[PDB]
């Protein structure tokens, strides 16, 4: 059965202004601005209020209504990134060879450079995505902090470190080394 009209509600906080024309969403707030292209989803937005926005699909199937909650949650993640901000904390651990993770400017761009992973002479370069800040906590030894307005970028770059240090041809029950996401959070904490 085709639902006549199914809706989801994107609640905008006090400091955020979102602009949506032709399913291109711009979200602006205290921590910066985000933009996403939603032109692949046939979905309809509506400003019911300055603090609420209604997203709706008319005459949709079971696969098409599966994309309303995705769109609503993507806009919600935008809003939380532009107010609270996303902060992924990764901890790298090692048994014998100490991993040396530094930040280097290679060719006008920014790179995480992982060295000595299990004694590899290979240098592993992970490009820093734009808007992601790579910071090294001093209070805790051997921990990387990624932060940004976009959960997608921060999580992708964190997973890029997670995968650049994958242990190959070893028993991963005994070889525990690598860079692991420890904690996914918000920059603020608490508002």
């Amino acid at each position: 059965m085709k639902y006549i009209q199914t809706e989801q509600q994107i609640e905008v906080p006090e400091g955020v202004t979102v602009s949506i024309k032709s399913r291109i969403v711009k979200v602006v707030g205290p921590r910066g601005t985000l933009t996403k292209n939603l032109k692949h989803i046939d979905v309809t937005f509506t400003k019911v209020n300055n603090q609420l926005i209604k997203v709706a699909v008319h005459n949709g199937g079971r696969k098409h209504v599966a994309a309303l909650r995705t769109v609503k949650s993507l806009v919600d993640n935008m809003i939380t990134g532009v107010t609270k901000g996303y902060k992924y904390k990764m901890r790298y651990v090692y048994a014998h060879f100490p991993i040396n993770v530094n930040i280097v400017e290679k060719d006008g761009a920014k790179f995480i450079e992982v060295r000595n992973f299990l004694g590899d002479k290979k240098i592993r370069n992970v490009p820093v995505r734009d808007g992601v800040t790579i910071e090294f906590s001093t209070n805790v030894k051997d921990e990387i902090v990624l932060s940004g307005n976009s959960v997608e970028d921060v999580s992708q770059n964190a997973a890029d470190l997670q995968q650049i240090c994958r242990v190959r041809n070893k028993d991963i029950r005994k070889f525990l080394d690598g860079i692991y996401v420890s904690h996914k959070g918000f920059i603020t904490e608490d508002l």
Partner: protein
């Protein structure tokens, strides 16, 4: 200064009281008010001031027009005609440029040869006037 802006497409709505334009069938080019909604594709329309019998018709057979008037759900032809009169739906329609384009096509299609010659000469006169108006300021 900083409010949310969302461009809302202003779709015509299939609603009780929306007036439609029957594009094919025995009621071609006649208005009709939507009386009840049957399902996604079919509705019950009624066009009593234009001579449309109360019927259930597909939505692909009519064209939604921007005009809407207050009308209770399920209104019989009597109150449909009364509300059509009270809301001046025919007048609002005829004032709309859509009805003017339709009436213009019906007027042009009825022109005989003499009137087409007259149109030619009048257009040449208005052309002389307009081209004089151009190249002037």
């Amino acid at each position: 200064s900083t409010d949310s802006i969302v461009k809302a497409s202003n779709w015509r709505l299939v609603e009780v009281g929306r007036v439609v334009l029957i594009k094919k069938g025995q009621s071609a080019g006649k208005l009709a008010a939507i009386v009840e909604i049957i399902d996604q594709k079919k509705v019950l329309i009624d066009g009593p001031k234009a001579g449309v019998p109360r019927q259930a018709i597909n939505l692909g057979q009519v064209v939604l027009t921007p005009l809407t008037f207050a009308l209770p759900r399920g209104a019989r032809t009597a109150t449909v005609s009364k509300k059509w009169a009270a809301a001046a739906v025919c007048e609002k329609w005829a004032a709309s440029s859509w009805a003017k384009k339709i009436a213009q096509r019906e007027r042009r299609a009825a022109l005989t040869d003499f009137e087409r010659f007259q149109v030619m000469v009048l257009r040449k006169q208005k052309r002389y006037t307009v081209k004089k108006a151009l190249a002037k300021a």
